[PDB]
Amino acid sequence: GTSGFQLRGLGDAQFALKEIDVSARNAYGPTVRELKETLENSGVKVTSNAPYHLVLVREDNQQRTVSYTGSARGAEFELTNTINYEIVGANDLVLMSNQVQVQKVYVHDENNLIGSDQEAAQLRSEMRRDLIQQLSMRLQALTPAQLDEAQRQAEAKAKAEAEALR
Known about the structure:
This protein is an alpha/beta fold. The protein has one domain (1-166): Double Stranded RNA Binding Domain, CATH 3.30.160.150. Helix content is 34%, strand content 29%. The chain contains three helices and five strands. It has helices at 30-41, 115-137, 144-164, and strands spanning 19-24, 45-46, 53-67, 76-88, 94-105. Strand 1 (19-24), helix 1 and strand 2 form a beta-alpha-beta unit. Helix 1 (30-41) packs across helix 2. It is classed as lipid binding protein. Keywords: LPS biosynthesis, lipid binding protein.
């Protein structure tokens, strides 16, 4: 009677990358924080020792008036968020760089002439979702091959300039 058999029920899935470092450049914000959480909770292990580094360079957040499309006194507010990040491989060399953005608009009522300004901060709670959901996704559509080649071609270019000079 042999019973050298294991169980089943593997729901875990494999990804391209399996380890990645979550870092930020110049201070730190919520974005880099939720990144680490979302990546960890998606099975990804985040280490300091990862071969590829995600570094978020800056986080911008635009509040401005779009004015009313007409001759009335409506005029709502629009919010554009821009999160810049870079993919650093080896030698502190940049493999690729990208920024993600989200554009929301605020509901402005005449009765809420003042309230709309106070409510505008309430959206901010939800804006926090947008960034992470869409930002994270790029990390799934990056493959080790793209990262490896991005280093290689960069090494060639950076060094080629050195060989060209003198």
